[PDB]
Amino acid sequence: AMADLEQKVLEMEASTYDGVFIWKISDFARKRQEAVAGRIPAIFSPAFYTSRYGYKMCLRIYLNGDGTGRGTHLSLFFVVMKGPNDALLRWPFNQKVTLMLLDQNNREHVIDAFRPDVTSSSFQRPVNDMNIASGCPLFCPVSKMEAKNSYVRDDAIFIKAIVDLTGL
C-alpha cells in the first residue's frame, strides 16, 4: 500500500485545477538516453484539470519522438483521461489545447496549439482509464534542445500545457 499511497500523494501534489499545468522533468539526460535505447520510450505526466470538477487530463512525451517524429523529434501528446465527474461534462472534449517547451532563458519558447477533432476517439467520453493520446509528433527537433541551447538547464526541462476554458 505504502507504494500506492505515495503515488496518490505525488498525484495530488502535482494536480492543478485551472487548465494550466507545468511539467518539470529532472534527470533529463538519463531519461533522454532511456528514450534512445528504447528502454523507456514515453513518460506520462501527473493528472491536472480544467476546474475543480472539470475534465481530467495529462500529457505523454517521447524524449526521442514517436511516429513521424521518432529518433529525430520530441513528441508531446495531450491525453484525455476518465474523470470522476465525466457524467457531468459536455462531450466530446472540444477545448483548444496549447502546449509549450519552456526556454529557461526566456527568449524563445517552443509553442504549438490545436483544436480537438470532435470525431477523434481521443476526445470522446472515456471508457478506458485513458483515451488515445494525440498532440504534436514533431513538437520540437532534438537538436533544438539536447546539446545545450536554453531549454535544458541544470539537467531539467519544463513542459507547459494550457487548456483553453471557453464555454466552461
Partner 1 sequence: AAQEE
List residues binding a copy of itself (CB under 8 A).
Answer: 1-2, 5-6, 8-9, 12-13, 16, 18, 20, 22, 24, 52-53, 84-85, 87-88, 102, 104, 106, 153-154, 156, 158
**What nine digits make up the cell of 165?**
476554458
137 binds partner 1 (CB under 8 A): yes
| Nearer to partner 1 (CB atom), residue 98 or residue 150 | 98
64 binds partner 1 (CB under 8 A): no
Residue at grid coordinates 512525451: 61
DSSP three-state, residue 105: coil
| Helix, strand, coil percentages in the chain from 3-state DSSP, rounded to 5 | 20, 35, 50
Q: Given candidates 74, 122, 152, 163, which one binds partner 1 under the rule CB under 8 A?
A: 122
Q: Quick one: 80 exposed, middle or buried, by C-beta within 10 A (0-12, 13-18, 19+)?
A: buried
State residue 81 phi and psi, 5-degree precision: -85, 165
| Nearer to a copy of itself (CB atom), residue 61 or residue 133 | 61
74 binds partner 1 (CB under 8 A): no
Number of H helices, E strands in the chain: 2, 9
CA dist 64 and 59 (Å) reads 15
Q: Given candidates 72, 114, 143, 168, which one binds partner 1 under the rule CB under 8 A?
A: 114
120 binds partner 1 (CB under 8 A): yes
Pick one of a copy of itself, partner 1, none as the site partner of residue 12 (Cβ within 5 to 8 A by kind). a copy of itself
